Design a protein around this ligand. Structure first.
Ligand SMILES: *[C@@H]1O[C@H](CO)[C@@H](O[C@@H]2O[C@H](CO)[C@@H](O[C@@H]3O[C@H](CO)[C@@H](O)[C@H](O[C@H]4O[C@H](CO)[C@@H](O)[C@H](O)[C@@H]4O[C@H]4O[C@H](CO)[C@@H](O)[C@H](O)[C@@H]4O[C@H]4O[C@H](CO)[C@@H](O)[C@H](O)[C@@H]4O)[C@@H]3O)[C@H](O)[C@H]2NC(C)=O)[C@H](O)[C@H]1NC(C)=O
Ligand SMILES: *[C@@H]1O[C@H](CO)[C@@H](O[C@@H]2O[C@H](CO)[C@@H](O[C@@H]3O[C@H](CO)[C@@H](O)[C@H](O[C@H]4O[C@H](CO)[C@@H](O)[C@H](O)[C@@H]4O[C@H]4O[C@H](CO)[C@@H](O)[C@H](O)[C@@H]4O[C@H]4O[C@H](CO)[C@@H](O)[C@H](O)[C@@H]4O)[C@@H]3O)[C@H](O)[C@H]2NC(C)=O)[C@H](O)[C@H]1NC(C)=O
Ligand SMILES: *[C@@H]1O[C@H](CO)[C@@H](O[C@@H]2O[C@H](CO)[C@@H](O[C@@H]3O[C@H](CO)[C@@H](O)[C@H](O[C@H]4O[C@H](CO)[C@@H](O)[C@H](O)[C@@H]4O[C@H]4O[C@H](CO)[C@@H](O)[C@H](O)[C@@H]4O[C@H]4O[C@H](CO)[C@@H](O)[C@H](O)[C@@H]4O)[C@@H]3O)[C@H](O)[C@H]2NC(C)=O)[C@H](O)[C@H]1NC(C)=O
Ligand SMILES: *[C@@H]1O[C@H](CO)[C@@H](O[C@@H]2O[C@H](CO)[C@@H](O[C@@H]3O[C@H](CO)[C@@H](O)[C@H](O[C@H]4O[C@H](CO)[C@@H](O)[C@H](O)[C@@H]4O[C@H]4O[C@H](CO)[C@@H](O)[C@H](O)[C@@H]4O[C@H]4O[C@H](CO)[C@@H](O)[C@H](O)[C@@H]4O)[C@@H]3O)[C@H](O)[C@H]2NC(C)=O)[C@H](O)[C@H]1NC(C)=O
Ligand SMILES: CCCN(CCc1ccccc1)C(=O)[C@@H]1OC(C(=O)O)=C[C@H](N)[C@H]1NC(C)=O
Ligand SMILES: CCCN(CCc1ccccc1)C(=O)[C@@H]1OC(C(=O)O)=C[C@H](N)[C@H]1NC(C)=O
Ligand SMILES: CCCN(CCc1ccccc1)C(=O)[C@@H]1OC(C(=O)O)=C[C@H](N)[C@H]1NC(C)=O
Ligand SMILES: CCCN(CCc1ccccc1)C(=O)[C@@H]1OC(C(=O)O)=C[C@H](N)[C@H]1NC(C)=O
Ligand SMILES: *[C@@H]1O[C@H](CO)[C@@H](O)[C@H](O)[C@H]1NC(C)=O
Ligand SMILES: *[C@@H]1O[C@H](CO)[C@@H](O)[C@H](O)[C@H]1NC(C)=O
Ligand SMILES: *[C@@H]1O[C@H](CO)[C@@H](O)[C@H](O)[C@H]1NC(C)=O
Ligand SMILES: *[C@@H]1O[C@H](CO)[C@@H](O)[C@H](O)[C@H]1NC(C)=O
Ligand SMILES: *[C@@H]1O[C@H](CO)[C@@H](O)[C@H](O)[C@H]1NC(C)=O
Ligand SMILES: *[C@@H]1O[C@H](CO)[C@@H](O)[C@H](O)[C@H]1NC(C)=O
Ligand SMILES: [Ca+2]
Ligand SMILES: [Ca+2]
Ligand SMILES: [Ca+2]
Ligand SMILES: [Ca+2]
Lengths: 388, 388, 388, 388
């Protein structure tokens, strides 16, 4: 009908309830399930769907061998019904590529896939299921994007891309699209030193993205975007509760405008909801590997450099594998406020479970409740020995 | 369009005709069929569908091992087209959980799934395919619900939950929802001593639920609900024709307000249509196990403590397995009265058939006819030796 | 929109062109294809579909063993997209039973399935996908129907049933339904001595059915029905070109009102288009088994007892298996006249091919052309040795 | 809504971006994928789909043995969602045949399939999914057509057929259809000596087809059609950059009205976009086999007999297999001009890869960009050793 506008604020998050779970690897042990990674969730005005980058083979298929590799010509952004597994028969291909983002602006959906050699990649923006705009690599070193949904406001959907080194200063740009066309683009501003895989959400006409400093920070960079003025700024989450992975142990005081040193050249896509006292951070439990997952209420994490948790909820136990995590919200749900949601990628196979030759994942997603619900852990559930 | 109102009374039930049957286990022997249990049937204004709690694996899949277990993080309420089997590719996930109920109010469908640890479970009410309300456990001992459809009247859909001991007094509540929000809730009233898995239907602005006293009764408790006044009362079916399982042999006189003693701490979800002389009870043929299934016309069973059958129809022979059974009706069918219907879960595998390591089921459902149709038996049809 | 009326006459049939073919057995050798038999084709105002009675198992599945049996509780009328195979995932169940018919009246579709023991069978009429009317067996000996589509005119859809002996006089009735309700029923009139599996079509407000005299006739009985007056009459096709199977060799002169003697207690469902000089009969090539299939133009076959073919077209070579065949037409196609169509069931497995333990079929269907198209043969195409 | 009119001209083609890729053979190694060949892509006003001629068996199925054969009764034109593989469950059959073309005129789609013995083949034209017109063979030697989409203008959709010798003069006709009926047909005019498998596109009320001279030309014939006047003319592409296969090495000067001699009785379906300086030719890299694929910008190739490439883009490396290629465009995309697109069939199996007994393909398709995008190669991706 009409372009969606971010007119509400977030609901109070007192706990998280189970939203969707696909049990993809359990089911894929004996069904035609596609090998995937880098999944996310994204809603249209009438339906919410699971998304991920397919590897172009089933798990049980012989071509699953080698799916630890990130970029190839056999990957594609696919979407499928909520809580179903990504099967060969119920999956819709959005575009061809090895990096992506996608969002509905209220009228229709824009999907962006990037493909190519490391030094000659290109992004093709699809709108209403047709290619509309194409952007060629500007730094010649793996043009890449969010790996989770973008957000729009009155037709304008900002998207964060990064081109260049994964372990040094790189060239990050914020593009502002409207109906698939580029309205404008900015170079990154503010104090964030490196940006990768931003996880975004919007409320009260402002867009907040929590990204990943793959270079030196263990605290996460944040990009606040103004989709009307088409401007932005960046900094790091101030809290000592560190959310990247691998990372050092939490200190007593964090940093607001500099990376917190400790681990270099590594990380994991993550997110956060930054809303004053209504602030919740997500992180792996393990400081060493992508293992376990918990949500921690850390009042004013963004600005208070000594903020510590006042409440929490375990999502995945530290004995189970986790992986990427990002934000999304059903901006079209009935109600007075936006209900915050998130997904966690549960990676199985290589590199941790080396008995199999593949790497794939299942998904678990939750949404906030104003109630204080009891907690449960939500692991992948597959038994690797069944695949040997 | 508009909220459905229970304006008709039941049609005369002179016999039962075959409505739907999925042959899930026969077909699943060589197709990607999901392992399920606790199925039911539920209609929308334009289509009737099969529902059940998936175990998150196919029957032939290696993860089918162990599906005798009731609660895990891999279960989900799924729905699929009438008479089709629950396959990985044609199944729609309604919500994540190990206990459920669902009903269409005329405008849209409300689905409720409960998940969690035994001591910290929670129910999340979905309406129009979005989470709306969440209720946390109140007795800390397996919050659970109907396992068959709820019923609505003018927007109000009562749902019966039980939290606490399965073998002692517990805390049962009747919630009255309208568009996913709680309008009110009551503690159980009347003489029923224990309530579990209520099977409900509605006619002439009143809702009747036949439940299961898992503690001491072999006669079944009934809850009559008034969805306008939002009040209810309870008692037991008076008839000596006992319908729980396991149960003692039928006596010559039954009890109206007390459990009929004999078997303790066990039972099976069942139902009945209580309509004066137009009364039919369903029960397993075996008094010892969930074996066989028959419908018996027992005039005034609800109130006459010496009522005995005047007619009957065998649905499943006593040599074949049965299981749960519940009521539903297509409240949107053309016609002068509501046609009573029911389904029977045909459980295969553990515990009775221990040669396989899984537990699953198929479904058979019938609806009433005003004609006196000839009868046939409707067993599952799968040959277990084919799975060894 | 509105009830369809048979306002046109048939187009001139100068040859037959390929309409649809599913290659079900070839494909089912390595796909989840359902075992079927007794197929047919039937159109709705916006789509034409393949129909058949499923055996409730896939071909490669272990339960395929024994599917030579006609009646069981695992059969169901299913429909699926034109030229696709009947797979577990793309098949829609219409009703449960081992004998059926179905037709669209212009507003919606009526489907009828019969199920039960041989002596207590019953038909349940579904209209707009809901059960509406039920008819119990009247002769207590396998109540059965057409096995191909019925035809409607202004809301009224006559259906021919037979109850009683398959090899003696039986009780055949013509029911006239309108919106699933019985308007009236007649006992068979005219000179036909036995009626089974009628194949019907309609033109210029009249319905013609070519059936099967399983008792003594090798010439086929015809029932002409007047759907407005709700009356009918019957006779046999006069031509010496015999179309039942097994049958004697063609004589020089046929019979109009008596069965042509020769083979007793056997036959095959077949059809014909009887339209003066525009008359075409279908028959197996073999007089001994269901082998081969050809269409022969026999001017005035219905009334001329010495009529012989003036043109023909081979559909299936005599070295390939055939089986049932029936008529249907897309009454909603654009055009000045109705294009005659037909399907042939290509049976594979038992009894002829005894190396496998199953019996199933694929379908080939053609429609008339006013052109004189070249011919090709259309066999099933599967290699039985691949299933051993 | 209304008939589509070719009112725009082509967009400037500065490079090609990835549009769709199905990875059919990789996926089919462990999924129910149909064996195909002769694929193409074609759009409707609201969706673009992949098309191909199925062989009526899956790749892993035993009937895949022998699919190197072109014509049989088990082939059918099928369509399926863009970038999905042609699976048994997501594929829609358009018509039965071993040669085809299809196009949407703006209101609905016309599909044409040809089937039959070599000497008695016939084409049946379907419009709005119903058979409408039938054409019988005129030269009695494999009546055949485009193998890629046709194009329409104001209701009129010309289609090029060829009947007769594949290695001598034959009888080629251009039929002009409107709503499935023949408005008129012409014998081929101009200087083209032989025509096979034309690849067409339209812009500014004119239709251009690049075909294949299977007899003596290594330069390609072009047919320009005027869909309003219903007339046409033909010639050869003048450029020395030869695009058929197998072919001689490029000379310094080409021929405009005669076949360029060198290879006889062979070729491959190909295409080109002829638009003055905005001209791009597609060709296999290898001059000997269907190996590799590249696009070359050759300004004024159609008329300049010494034109050579000024830019290029490799699509498939010469170490990977290619095959047929053709044109299509989404005539319903938003925008000021038509974006040129094309697909390449990536053939795997026989005859080149003789270790397997089947022949099948996957598809890669690209569309033009006004940007100068970096390039990547897009091979099939399957490992044949996995099928042994
Ligand atoms: C029924 O359900 C309810 C609702 O869920 C249950 O109640 C909830 O119970 C939760 C579990 O206790 C509770 O969460 C906890 O909340 C406290 C604040 O009150 C919070 O501090 C906890 O978080 C710390 O603890 C967990 C491990 O327990 C850590 O994994 C987490 O990271 C937090 O500690 C780490 O960081 C802190 C800040 O930097 C450090 O001070 C601390 O030392 C620790 O650091 C080490 O570990 C880090 C992680 O590996 C590492 O990075 C660092 O370097 C150090 O090595 C936790 O969130 C909920 O608040 C509570 N909710 C409610 C409403 O009550 C109830 O139990 C259930 N009922 C039953 C019968 O079970
Ligand atoms: C064509 O189709 C028609 C239509 O279906 C057929 O006609 C129908 O035939 C039915 C079968 O005879 C008939 O049903 C019976 O109806 C009578 C009342 O008329 C009813 O009493 C029967 O029910 C008792 O019998 C069955 C076993 O036969 C029991 O399983 C059932 O539970 C009932 O008995 C038990 O409970 C009674 C009440 O408490 C006790 O008095 C009795 O002893 C027995 O108790 C023991 O068994 C219990 C069950 O295990 C146990 O819990 C208890 O502790 C005791 O151990 C049955 O419903 C239909 O009424 C009739 N319908 C019509 C319209 O006529 C016809 O046969 C078919 N035609 C052909 C040729 O076959
Ligand atoms: C390109 O395509 C065109 C178009 O299709 C081809 O032209 C067509 O060619 C057809 C084949 O010749 C031709 O069909 C024949 O038409 C004649 C009438 O003109 C018709 O009589 C033929 O039918 C008899 O013959 C076939 C076997 O050839 C039998 O199977 C059939 O049943 C008919 O014979 C049987 O019944 C008769 C009547 O009772 C008996 O007189 C006769 O003896 C025979 O009886 C025995 O066999 C019976 C069957 O088993 C059995 O029941 C009985 O007891 C006896 O044992 C046939 O239909 C088309 O008319 C013609 N169409 C056109 C427009 O020309 C052309 O060849 C193709 N081009 C090329 C190069 O091939
Ligand atoms: C990032 O991406 C960009 C964008 O793609 C890259 O830049 C592009 O790089 C392309 C590759 O160099 C370049 O394409 C080439 O363009 C030139 C014109 O400038 C064109 O001549 C090239 O085509 C010839 O060369 C290829 C092999 O290189 C041949 O396969 C092709 O057929 C052409 O040569 C053949 O035909 C000619 C004409 O007849 C003959 O003169 C020539 O000898 C040759 O003939 C033989 O081979 C034939 C084929 O087998 C055979 O039939 C014949 O008989 C003879 O045996 C090629 O298209 C793009 O123009 C350029 N694009 C842009 C915008 O710059 C950049 O490299 C990437 N960045 C990085 C870091 O890699
Ligand atoms: C830092 C995150 C993105 N990068 C670095 C890409 C890069 C490598 C080398 C040089 C420059 C850039 C990653 O490797 C991501 O890592 C991970 C990962 O699990 O950490 C998976 C992503 N599939 C991958 N992204 C891409 C495009 O390959
Ligand atoms: C009495 C019916 C519900 N209960 C008891 C739950 C309970 C156990 C122990 C203590 C308290 C409560 C059951 O076990 C039901 O039994 C059966 C059953 O077949 O009898 C299957 C149901 N899947 C299960 N329900 C749940 C939630 O697990
Ligand atoms: C004559 C056609 C219908 N009959 C006879 C049914 C009957 C048997 C014995 C006594 C009375 C009636 C058939 O056997 C048909 O035969 C055949 C067949 O291939 O000849 C298949 C049909 N599936 C079957 N119909 C039914 C209902 O079983
Ligand atoms: C020249 C292209 C079409 N022909 C020649 C048909 C023909 C043969 C012999 C005599 C006359 C005509 C082809 O063989 C095409 O070749 C090829 C091919 O890969 O070259 C595949 C096509 N499936 C096939 N077309 C048909 C209809 O069979
Ligand atoms: C969003 O705001 C714009 C004007 O700023 C308005 O035209 C549009 O309809 C609004 N969207 C909705 C969904 O109301
Ligand atoms: C149900 O009754 C309410 C008023 O009590 C009415 O507004 C509604 O339309 C009724 N529903 C239908 C389906 O008529
Ligand atoms: C069929 O005829 C009836 C009246 O006899 C008419 O009301 C109906 O609309 C007609 N059907 C169509 C499709 O015109
Ligand atoms: C099929 O069943 C029969 C009888 O039930 C048995 O002897 C036969 O061996 C079975 N065939 C196969 C392949 O299992
Ligand atoms: C195409 O042109 C015809 C008239 O020449 C017109 O009637 C039709 O609507 C046009 N099509 C569109 C899509 O405008
Ligand atoms: C395929 O068929 C040929 C000839 O029909 C046969 O020799 C060959 O072995 C078959 N190949 C396989 C793998 O079955
Ligand atoms: Ca980091
Ligand atoms: Ca009990
Ligand atoms: Ca006979
Ligand atoms: Ca050539």
């Amino acid at each position: 009908r009409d372009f969606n506008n971010l007119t509400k604020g977030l609901c109070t998050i007192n706990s998280w309830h189970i939203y969707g779970k696909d049990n993809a690897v359990r089911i894929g042990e004996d069904s035609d399930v596609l090998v995937t990674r880098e999944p996310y969730v994204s809603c249209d005005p009438d339906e919410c769907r699971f998304y991920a980058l397919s590897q172009g083979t089933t798990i049980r298929g012989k071509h699953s061998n080698g799916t630890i590799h990130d970029r190839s010509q056999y990957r594609a952004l696919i979407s499928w019904p909520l809580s179903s597994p990504p099967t060969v028969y119920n999956s819709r291909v959005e575009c061809i590529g090895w990096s992506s983002t996608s969002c509905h602006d209220g009228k229709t959906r824009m999907s962006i896939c990037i493909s190519g050699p490391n030094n000659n990649a290109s992004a093709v923006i699809w709108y209403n299921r047709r290619p509309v705009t194409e952007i060629n690599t500007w730094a010649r070193n793996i043009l890449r994007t969010q790996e989770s949904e973008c957000v729009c406001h009155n037709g304008v959907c900002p998207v964060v891309f990064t081109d260049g080194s994964a372990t040094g200063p790189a060239e990050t740009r914020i593009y502002y699209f409207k109906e698939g066309k580029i309205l404008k683009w900015e170079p990154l501003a503010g104090t964030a030193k490196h940006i990768e895989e931003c996880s975004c959400y919007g409320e009260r006409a402002e867009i907040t993205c929590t990204c990943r400093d793959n270079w030196q920070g263990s605290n996460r960079p944040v990009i606040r975007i103004d989709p009307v003025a088409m401007t932005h700024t960046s900094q790091y989450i101030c809290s000592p509760v560190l959310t990247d992975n691998p990372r050092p142990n939490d200190p007593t005081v964090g940093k607001c405008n500099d990376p917190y040193p400790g681990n270099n050249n590594n990380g994991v896509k993550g997110f956060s909801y930054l809303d004053g006292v209504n602030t919740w951070l997500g992180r792996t439990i393990s400081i060493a590997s992508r293992s376990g997952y918990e949500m921690l209420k850390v009042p004013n994490a963004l600005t208070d450099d000594k903020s510590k948790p006042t409440q929490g909820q375990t999502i995945v136990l530290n004995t189970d594998w986790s992986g990427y995590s990002g934000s999304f919200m059903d901006y079209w749900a009935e109600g007075e406020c936006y209900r915050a949601c998130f997904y966690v990628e549960l990676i199985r196979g290589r590199p941790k479970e080396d008995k199999v030759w593949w790497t794939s994942n299942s998904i678990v997603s939750m949404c906030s409740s104003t109630e204080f619900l009891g907690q449960w852990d939500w692991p992948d559930g597959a038994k690797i020995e069944y695949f040997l």
